[PDB]
Symmetry: C3
Subunit: 214 residues, 3 copies
């Protein structure tokens, strides 16, 4: 990792103005492909999660969430270890984008986002809510470890990941569940899906979601 840029803002500043896949050079000297959104809200956003069509299975294990998974062309999770390494230094603001089946867009912004390391179960450290038409459904999850079906760290007598078919910084269980089970419409919706409580509520999911940092 022969130098490279440290984030999407730096790529943009350097003249990379089209959104798409770029390599960042991580602090440890490892190259990482990432999707940079160079257009929304001034550009320079590192998109680390995307839901679009239900083509990719998000009901995955600790190791899968740790390393990342999915398809560049469609849906993915960048990986918790990548996110921890990226967010160690610098202030990264979080933007969440949501789109319902009508094509109505809503959003949520948070001042900072950081994940602790694997020993701390990639615990979420979330900054304060700034603004968002979708409302705040992630603050509850701040301070909580990540749990998957094979790594129960939540505050429930059960395994929330198993219970609600996802992976997240579950409590018992959630106000948000963006790595939840995909549904192509309300009819096909699951009890627990790609939900944002303060927007459309539990059991009433979104068609497209993105989570992004700048």
């Amino acid at each position: 990792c022969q130098e490279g840029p440290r984030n999407c803002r730096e790529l943009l500043s350097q003249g990379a103005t089209l959104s798409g896949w770029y390599h960042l050079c991580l602090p440890e000297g490892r190259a990482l492909p990432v999707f940079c959104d160079m257009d929304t809200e001034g550009g320079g956003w590192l998109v680390f999660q995307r839901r679009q069509d239900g083509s990719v299975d998000f009901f995955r294990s600790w190791s899968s969430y740790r390393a990342g998974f999915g398809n560049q062309e469609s849906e993915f999770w960048l990986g918790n270890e990548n996110l921890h390494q990226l967010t160690l230094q610098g202030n990264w603001e979080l933007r969440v984008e949501l789109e319902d089946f009508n094509g109505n867009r809503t959003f949520a912004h948070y001042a900072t986002f950081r994940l602790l390391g694997e020993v701390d179960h990639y615990q979420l450290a979330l900054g304060k809510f700034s603004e968002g038409t979708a409302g705040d459904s992630l603050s509850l999850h701040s301070g909580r470890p990540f749990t998957t079906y094979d790594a129960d760290h939540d505050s429930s007598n059960s395994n929330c990941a198993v219970i609600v078919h996802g992976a997240w910084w579950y409590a018992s269980c959630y106000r948000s569940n963006l790595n939840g089970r995909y549904a192509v419409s309300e009819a096909a919706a699951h009890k627990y899906g790609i939900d944002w409580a303060s927007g459309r509520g539990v059991g009433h999911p979104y068609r497209r979601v993105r989570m992004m940092l700048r």
Copy 2:
């Protein structure tokens, strides 16, 4: 690094997609290469498909380029100037209507002058094309955006027609105009090619390409 798409094709890159070019300033430039059409080696510098990207942008935005490699984009006037400094690049314009019929226009050469000359279009002869000629009018004219009026109208054509182009008063083509998903949704001024479907009768997909 490679300086264009034909160079890339010659070295064995035979699949159409995104590649990196090396600009004179030692800058890496992502570009879309069409490695198939008419033998291949075409740098696609503008694409419209779905209305997902806003094309009503400022001088600075058009100078730098904007958009999404996954969908619609404008490569950027400065990028285009630097690319076309040398060589004679042929221009191919591809249009697709709402029924899916494709038509085209071919111009012998395409070059943009520098920013001091307002990215003036230098265009060779229309050679052939089922879409007919709707760019010759614009040859020799500076680029105009809503915040930088260089056209031949007392008003600002970019504002009147909601786009950016080498406007006169105002246009025979307007490929950076406002997107419309169907006819029914058509704007008075849209993604238009006057010799093709005419002003006010837009296309669903457009590509502008150099080779």
Copy 3:
């Protein structure tokens, strides 16, 4: 990238998509890596899925590769020969019918000889596969295109069946064959796998991949 998709995955490349491999000669080769299927690390060298790309192509086109990163392609015979000069590459064939049913075929090893040997297929033993074995017949045979007949037939298999393959007289598999959008539009010879749906009963989606 390193030598194959497994090595990329092992270095942290966990998202499926287009990566670069560095070939023996020192040429960078864009390839698609599937980082998920059966643990991931598969290099996909052929993909069919729409019919948007013409697969009835010449010897030199099959040598160099052709298609679109976003959709259908053939990686190229010379590329495959270079990749398989070293290492052990298992072949996985993925087939999908018009109902979404997915079947597979696995072979222990896969290698292509050089051009002087007409990119002859060197195929290992069929291990398992719900689609059954329809490539074993083709092992040890030269590749054939409409402009280069090397098959075991008095005719040109590539012309008769409209594709390109390691034809005998003619085939039990024809995955580079003419696309069909339905079972109703099916051709005498199409994208066929004898032991699967059989000759004349084509698939909607196909991938050929190595690990």
